[PDB]
Amino acid sequence: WTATSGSCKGRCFELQEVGPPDCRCDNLCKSYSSCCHDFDELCLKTARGWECTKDRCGEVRNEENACHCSEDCLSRGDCCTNYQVVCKGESHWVDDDCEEIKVPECPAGFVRPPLIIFSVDGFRASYMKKGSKVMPNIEKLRSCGTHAPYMRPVYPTKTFPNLYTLATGLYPESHGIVGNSMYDPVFDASFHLRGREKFNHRWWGGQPLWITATKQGVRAGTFFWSVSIPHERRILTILQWLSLPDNERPSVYAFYSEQPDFSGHKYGPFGPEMTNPLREIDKTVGQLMDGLKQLRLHRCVNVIFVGDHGMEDVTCDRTEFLSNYLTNVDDITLVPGTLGRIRAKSINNSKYDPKTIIAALTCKKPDQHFKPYMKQHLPKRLHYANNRRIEDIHLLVDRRWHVARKPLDVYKKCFFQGDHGFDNKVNSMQTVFVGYGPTFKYRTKVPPFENIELYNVMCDLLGLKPAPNNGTHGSLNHLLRTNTFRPTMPDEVSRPNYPGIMYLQSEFDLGCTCDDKVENKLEELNKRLHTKGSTKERHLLYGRPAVLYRTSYDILYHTDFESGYSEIFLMPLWTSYTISKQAEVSSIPEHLTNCVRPDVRVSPGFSQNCLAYKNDKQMSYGFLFPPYLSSSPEAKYDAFLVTNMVPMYPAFKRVWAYFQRVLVKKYASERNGVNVISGPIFDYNYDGLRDTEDEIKQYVEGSSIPVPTHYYSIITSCLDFTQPADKCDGPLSVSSFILPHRPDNDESCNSSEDESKWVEELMKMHTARVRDIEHLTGLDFYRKTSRSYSEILTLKTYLHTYESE
Ligand SMILES: *[C@@H]1O[C@H](CO)[C@@H](O[C@@H]2O[C@H](CO)[C@@H](O[C@@H]3O[C@H](CO[C@H]4O[C@H](CO)[C@@H](O)[C@H](O[C@H]5O[C@H](CO)[C@@H](O)[C@H](O)[C@@H]5O[C@H]5O[C@H](CO)[C@@H](O)[C@H](O)[C@@H]5O)[C@@H]4O)[C@@H](O)[C@H](O[C@H]4O[C@H](CO)[C@@H](O)[C@H](O)[C@@H]4O[C@H]4O[C@H](CO)[C@@H](O)[C@H](O)[C@@H]4O)[C@@H]3O)[C@H](O)[C@H]2NC(C)=O)[C@H](O)[C@H]1NC(C)=O
Ligand SMILES: COCC(=O)N1CCC(c2ccc3c(c2)C(=O)N(CC(=O)N(C)Cc2ccc(C#N)c(Cl)c2)CC3)CC1
Ligand SMILES: [Ca+2]
Ligand SMILES: [Ca+2]
Ligand SMILES: [Cl-]
Ligand SMILES: [K+]
Ligand code: NA
Ligand SMILES: [Zn+2]
Known about the structure:
This protein is α+β, with helices and mostly antiparallel strands. It is 22% helix and 16% strand. α9 runs parallel beside α11. The longest helix has 22 residues. The radius of gyration is 30 Å and the shape is elongated. Its EC number is 3.1.4.39, 3.1.4.4.
């Protein structure tokens, strides 16, 4: 119930929402069927449209008009945005030359530059170039301010998950808005763009910017807008709020446009019908900037022009149907379209089998345009698992395609030519970022970055302390003239031990054998020096990683590699080695095929054992430093130390061996040397964070040797590839991966072929940021470089995507 019989007189677009059954006059009242009887009349004026004309100049104020051209309109804050242009001979903002904004130039009473966030739905990155001729206001913001060539959305590349990620700095698995529609099995309820369910605050986790601002005494405009409020009225409303008294005026404002997404769905991303919506959004930017310039705020406000995701060509005829794969298609519920999520139609059904559903969907047709995954097996870079609203079964759909349950679902809803929701690495899903104002840099291009980073920046722009989030604060300092944020390295929690030779061979009963008893004063001092860390500056180029949790570990030095060996997990946490452009690949000699050697620096009780591997018929082992890349036949013996061994499924060893034998050397050749840091990851509860020992669900049979869920590598070289990795004077270049440690290669449909036909494709799919590895390991990398910490934070957030240009 609402008693809608009160009035909006003097309350139009009030900032504080009043509680039922009192009637409302705020920008959301329409959506709730709760506005006062006179809201349309008083608050949604439309008479005479949105522009001043010559004949309206200096008119007698008529309070019925949409906006005003009367002399008193500047005082009242309610002129048409072009008033000064038409009636006072001023120029439109877009026609002014651009001039550096070195300091904020704000009216008296402004305590800080306001932030206006102008969000555009479906605004694909390449619109900036391709629509440049029809978007002069946007193109001015872009060339004069700070811009990226594109901004990476979060997965799924849908509207609500991305807008709410922009507001919170959180992955959708953390904020809870995991799709445009979602079912919560605990609420037994579904969230959709339509209807009232989305209104309940129970769906919306984290702390969005408006709440962060309010808690810290910074006032915030409403970020949600009722769809029927036209754009011109949203702009006028922002400009009116900006004219409020100092104690009442918000410092942060949001404008949202449903375009170009709305037309993009109908016409495709580059349909000829798309020119007009781009012109119309540009005109709305023009209105805002002219409006700001009238209020003398155009060199005071920081403006962010940001999109939520792009748009791809997608038609009804490119739909894969599940009824073409499954027989029990009526026992499932599918969230369809540009991603798939499958769950049981009934929870009272104990004969529903996720395993058999997955198998019936795997590599079934040679051209198949989707891939099924258990959610925990999805690429870690998607961060799309740790929420009860994400179904166990996930389908990653190829760009340009849809998935649906049955044909009747498509014709009983061709409508559409565009859609979005695909993997956030896809070029067509990339969106835009422009920042313009006194706190942003002038005429500056920044590298592409992820939208999860922007919350920290918007907090910096507002003098706010951000709530805990998934951004890496400091990684976008290079966007800002001032207000940076001064990041500092996390303190190391565990310091390493440096063990010497402490154990005789015969103290070990590891059930290991090696053919290594072949017997010089020149080269015995030499080997001693190597074990003490003589070559460490060659193989550890950026300092040892810091361990950020409490544990017991040893640094072990070798001629060819250095490692941080965990006495708790019985294996290295990290192994670091450099491979120069000139390095040679060798074989594992025949006599050394099954060689594993006790490490006399490490106790029998903190070592793995070969017997466990012999007894575990599913589990084999591999090595973190590859024996193929030994510097000499003598150094090769170090590669077979028990302290370099890790548990590996035979299926995974195919992947790993190819990476180590072929790919590392290829990268060293291409990049002029590489430094590699490799190691295990344990994430059995799929939360993206390092497992404690008591979370491990799988051990090597009859041992305390834990089985990794993933293996990582971070591959660093010089950005200036004329300099070798080990003698690099300037910025660095990195690519990294987090490979799932799986007992089959069901994910790679061509895995029956030679590794040269599928391994690198798998690794590319599982590309990662250094920061993703840091969360999963509790390690902190690049502790000792000649580069600024802000720069290193940018480096740690980089993702190598392997998309074309
Ligand atoms: C991305 O950034 C985010 C933000 O920093 C990181 O997420 C944080 O991760 C922390 C560790 O996982 C986590 O801390 C836990 O908080 C528990 C209290 O949580 C509530 O309060 C906070 C703060 O206001 C709130 O944000 C939480 O919101 C979640 O849940 C609501 C619904 O209740 C959702 O609306 C919302 O979207 C959000 O959901 C997400 O997080 C939860 C987990 O909290 C997931 O389950 C969801 O799927 C979704 O992802 C909560 O309202 C606190 O109880 C925990 O403490 C336990 O563990 C420690 C171990 O040291 C122990 O000392 C404690 O005693 C306690 O153990 C006891 O409880 C156990 C569990 O019930 C039990 O088994 C034990 O036996 C004990 O009795 C813990 O500190 C923090 O909440 C989230 N924050 C957010 C916003 O998600 C995220 O990790 C980053 N991602 C990456 C990859 O880096
Ligand atoms: C914790 O916060 C929850 C809250 O305060 N709520 C109260 C408001 C209620 C509500 C009420 C009414 C509506 C809508 C939501 C609603 O979604 N639309 C659609 C819509 O605005 N856009 C598509 C654009 C949009 C703009 C910004 C963001 C963001 N960040 C997002 Cl995600 C979307 C308009 C109608 C939801 C719950
Ligand atoms: Ca959208
Ligand atoms: Ca974990
Ligand atoms: Cl969805
Ligand atoms: K075995
Ligand atoms: Na396969
Ligand atoms: Zn859309």
